[PDB]
Amino acid sequence: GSVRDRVSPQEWEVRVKLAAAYRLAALKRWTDHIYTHFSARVPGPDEHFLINAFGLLFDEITASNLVKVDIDGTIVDDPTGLGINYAGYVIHSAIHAARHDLQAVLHTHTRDGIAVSAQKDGLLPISQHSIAFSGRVAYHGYEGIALDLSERERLVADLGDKSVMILRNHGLLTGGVSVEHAIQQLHALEYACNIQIAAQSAGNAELVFPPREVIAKVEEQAKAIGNGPGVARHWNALIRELERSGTDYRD
Amino acid sequence: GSVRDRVSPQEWEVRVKLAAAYRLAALKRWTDHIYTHFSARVPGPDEHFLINAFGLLFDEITASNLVKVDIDGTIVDDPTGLGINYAGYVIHSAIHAARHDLQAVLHTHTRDGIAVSAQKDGLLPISQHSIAFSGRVAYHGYEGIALDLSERERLVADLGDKSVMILRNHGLLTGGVSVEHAIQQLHALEYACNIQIAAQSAGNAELVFPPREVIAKVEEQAKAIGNGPGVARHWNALIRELERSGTDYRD
Amino acid sequence: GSVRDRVSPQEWEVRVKLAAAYRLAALKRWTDHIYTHFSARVPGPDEHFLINAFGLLFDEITASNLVKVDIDGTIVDDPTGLGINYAGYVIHSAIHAARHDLQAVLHTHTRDGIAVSAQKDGLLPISQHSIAFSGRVAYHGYEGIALDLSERERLVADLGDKSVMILRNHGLLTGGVSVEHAIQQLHALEYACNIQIAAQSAGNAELVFPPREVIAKVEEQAKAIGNGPGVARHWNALIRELERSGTDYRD
Amino acid sequence: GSVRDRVSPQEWEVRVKLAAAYRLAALKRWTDHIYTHFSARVPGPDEHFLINAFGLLFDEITASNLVKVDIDGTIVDDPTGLGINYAGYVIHSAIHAARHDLQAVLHTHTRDGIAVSAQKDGLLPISQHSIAFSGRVAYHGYEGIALDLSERERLVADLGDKSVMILRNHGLLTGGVSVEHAIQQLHALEYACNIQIAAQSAGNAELVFPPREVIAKVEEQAKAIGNGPGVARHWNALIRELERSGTDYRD
């Protein structure tokens, strides 16, 4: 294992975690073929980041084949020779630069995530799962495929201090203080969206909205919560489940 | 097998049944990662109960690794050293204490169960499967994640004499005189919800509601029915299907 | 193989075909656990019929374990000792007695079949798949679980000369001049329903209804069609696909 | 391998590609049993085309068993002796004759493709995936199963210069300058439809439509795009994924 021989032990553990995140997304079917990306900061004094190689499926990602790039997307270490999807990295770059606290940035294009993205009122407070996101979610209006400077500014302004964003007509974005934290938020958000699409099948007018005070209570209940013990527990079970398919991801 | 060596044969058989119930829910995809729980009373002179260890997936549960707790959730026998989700057990505790007849209490967070939970009119009488629940279903208004004393009282009052409850905006709850009885009711309810979400895709106004007399007839037809021979038959087939994936659940 | 030793070669081939139909329904997920049933007439001078044993899953059915019953549901030959679901057989009995041309009667409780059943306008003419059923489909109003004499009469009157019925709020019924013919109609109907539930997700008012003449043309195009060469071709591919899972069904 | 011994290396590579396209559609569940078809032009001085043999599943198709036919559907080389679905080939023939640039023509009958087909406003501009098709999509009104001369003319007129068509109440059609190009467009269109059906579950009135300028921008962004490097990358990943199930398709 030549990659693990030359990188810091701290970089290696993040390579393993980010690769597991790619494979988990594949297992949970949060994928859109070769498009969309998960990034993580390499711990250390350098503004370096890990992302998938250009054209590999989430299913193929390993600790060893992730690509290390700088804030601009310039290859620092590409064990594949495939490089990266330079245009797909811009959103990751914009967020990582603006928010040094976010060590991981996930973006997905799932059926139900995009579906919720495409609705005026976005994510509704109609389930325990969605209500837990009350006051945690940023929205960003759709501006096209490429993220120009004008939009990059608005994207950061829209996110503000939050770590979950719905990219309207586009999909979902989650940040975290770790890969584990980002993935826990993404997993929960994706489920909240699954449930919304079913719930609303007869129209939003059939929905029961719990009272504002109840929403507020759940907000307080969830406000006690990315370095908490609940993150590690959730993640460790995902890992045990993943390993059930073999351990290639961490080579 | 050290667990089976020290527990009563009656406790052991309930450990096996409750473990099968966890694995069946995993097979049928009634799961929400590591959240939600199934409990059973340990037969005997002690108010002791079995539940999953904190952080294990339904897929991992075995007769040997279930945790035995008292009515408060205090460990009596924890073969895993993981303890339990103390806060998740409160609903089980509230119901078991109030209703000594219910030997099993199941709670789920499925896509379609929560979806039906989230609708004003809840479960509609529009299919044989849903109509069979007519007059069997309690509703409980959503009050947040943690179940405080004020809500615990209302939860018991809402359930009354029934053994099926829709926890609005939250999910489904089933009780039974046995694990088998509880699981049969849950299986049927979950299917009734699947069917409702499809049925109503063009709006509730497109639905055919059979006449009241017909609903009443089905109520009488189902009123002949948790110690009946139909429970054992349904359960024994679930077991044969489960065993098709291996017999680890009963170790 | 003791069953095959004592039955006519003509009975044996229908046992094989009906068992394949049970397993195919399981493969295609047209099942409702241990409920619902497929029946076939045993060719010969006796009014005898084959059906699943009480409590077996569709997945478990074999040529050897099907049960032979008379028009009343009395066991003639039960290789399992499990008998039959006597109450579930009544619908099969009512139709087989009334329509000697129908050598097979299938009844299902699928998510989308029941969903379409539950709607005022039933199956809409909005896809090639649904339009092909125009003028082929009977409807029967829901009257409860048990089929009493009053309802048995109406069921036969409702079906009339047709061989496809939507049992409102209940599910789907298909007949055929053979198991192959019945299964082809059921497969097509189930797909037409899948498509309808998706199509109508924004309401029936968003639907494009092709002109009446076009519907009429498709009716004529499908009117050329249960002993045609298209039935055998469709069935033979289902069999090849089934055999991909092993050949236990025909033992 | 007798087929590969007698055909040009250029024909052989298209046989391999078209077979992979059939198996991929099976893997991605874009199938309707034995109905629907993918065609490709055989490179060379002859107006010859490849299509599946009559009655084989997409899952069974191999480079060796594809059938070579002329523009009329007359067998030129049928390694199976099964011939072709002559009536199913007419749409392929009509398009291939009219548009010599299209080396591949795909037609599908998927749940969500037909569903979108069945709606007045067809494919809505409410997601990145659908907006990318803005101004690329032809519509053709439904006229029945058989494609007569009057309809053949209208079908070609409706398609015009485009290479993507929604066959209203019927399903989807994609063309391409290669099998790879056609498949990339089909994959994207099918996903756009999946997302639309979810998005619109509470009605089209809940949808956010990005402004016209934003749609226009995406049109320009996608207008840079069937011989581009993005086609090969998308296709090569599909192939790697397919090969994960074995390499029978290319024998």
Q: Are B67 and B53 in contact (CB under 8 A)?
A: yes
Longest dimension (CA), chain D: 59
DSSP string across D184-227 = HHHHHHHHHHHHHHHHGGG-GGGB----HHHHHHHHHHHH----
The CA–CA distances, whole Å, from D127 to A28, D193, D210 equal 22, 10, 9
Sheet holding B171-176, edge to edge: B75-77, B67-70, B48-51, B38-41, B104-108, B171-176, B164-167, B137-140
The beta-carbon neighbor of C119 closest among B191, B206, B218 is B206
Measured in whole angstroms, the distance separating CA B37 from the mean position of its chain's CA atoms is: 8
Instruction: Give the span between the Cα atoms of C201 and C204, in whole angstroms.
Output: 8
| Nearest Cα to Cα of residue B156 among B177, B179, B140, B170 | B140
Instruction: Give the span between the Cα atoms of C152 and C158, in whole angstroms.
Output: 10
In chain D, which residues have their Cβ closer than 8 Å to the Cβ of C127?
114, 117-118, 169-170
Crossing angle of helices B9-27/B229-243, nearest 10°? 70
Longest dimension (CA), chain B: 59
Query: How was this entry determined?
Result: X-ray
Confirm or reject CATH 3.40.225.10 for domain A1-251, answering yes or no: yes
Q: Nearest CA of chain B to the CA of A148: how many Å?
A: 38
Q: Are D40 and D32 in contact (CB under 8 A)?
A: no
Q: Are C114 and B132 an interchain contact pair (Cβ–Cβ within 8 Å)?
A: no
Environment class of D75 (CB within 10 Å of its CB; exposed 0-12, middle 13-18, buried 19+): middle
Alpha helices in D145-178 (DSSP H): 149-159
Q: Rounded to the nearest 5 degrees, what angle is found at the Cα of D202, between the Cα atoms of D200 and D208?
A: 55
Residues in Cβ contact with C56 at an 8 Å cutoff, skipping those fewer than 6 apart:
B237, C34, C65, C80, C82
Residues in Cβ contact with C71 at an 8 Å cutoff, skipping those fewer than 6 apart:
C47, C49, C93, C96, C97
In chain D, which residues have their Cβ closer than 8 Å to the Cβ of C207?
118-120
In chain B, which residues have their Cβ closer than 8 Å to the Cβ of A222?
145
Residues in Cβ contact with A115 at an 8 Å cutoff, skipping those fewer than 6 apart:
A193, A197, D195, D198, D199, D201
The CA–CA distances, whole Å, from C146 to B230, C89, C246, D112 equal 16, 11, 37, 37
Which residue numbers of A have CB closer than 8 Å to B's CBs?
A: 126-129, 131-132, 187, 191, 194-195, 198-199, 201-203, 206-208, 210, 214, 217-218, 221-222, 233-234, 236-238, 240-241
Read off the DSSP letter of residue C180.
H
Q: Nearest CA of chain C to the CA of B130: how many Å?
A: 10
* Mutation for C interface: D54, D114, D245, most C CBs within 10 A: D114
| Nearest Cα to Cα of residue D21 among D62, D55, D72, D53 | D62
The CA–CA distances, whole Å, from D191 to A32, C11, D28, D170 equal 9, 47, 11, 17
Q: Nearest CA of chain C to the CA of D217: how many Å?
A: 28
Q: Which two tokens stand for residue D251?
A: 């024998």
**Residue type at D155 in one-letter notation:** L
Q: Which two tokens stand for residue D66?
A: 């594809």
Q: Are B135 and B142 in contact (CB under 8 A)?
A: no
* Mutation for A interface: B111, B139, B143, most A CBs within 10 A: B111
Tell me the structure's resolution in angstroms, rounded to a single decimal.
Answer: 2.0
Q: Are B147 and B73 in contact (CB under 8 A)?
A: no
Q: Are A71 and A152 in contact (CB under 8 A)?
A: no
How many inter-chain contacts (B to C, CB under 8 Å) are there?
Answer: 93
Q: Nearest CA of chain C to the CA of D109: how many Å?
A: 9
Element (H, E) at A68: strand A67-70
Instruction: Give the span between the Cα atoms of C191 and C180, in whole angstroms.
Output: 17
In chain D, which residues have their Cβ closer than 8 Å to the Cβ of A140?
none
Residues in Cβ contact with C162 at an 8 Å cutoff, skipping those fewer than 6 apart:
C136, C137, C138
Kind of pairing, strands D104-108 and D137-140?
Answer: unpaired
Neighbours of C238 (CB within 10 A): 23
What region does A81 belong to: left with phi over 0, alpha with psi -120 to 50, or beta?
left
Q: Where are the domains of chain D?
A: 1-251
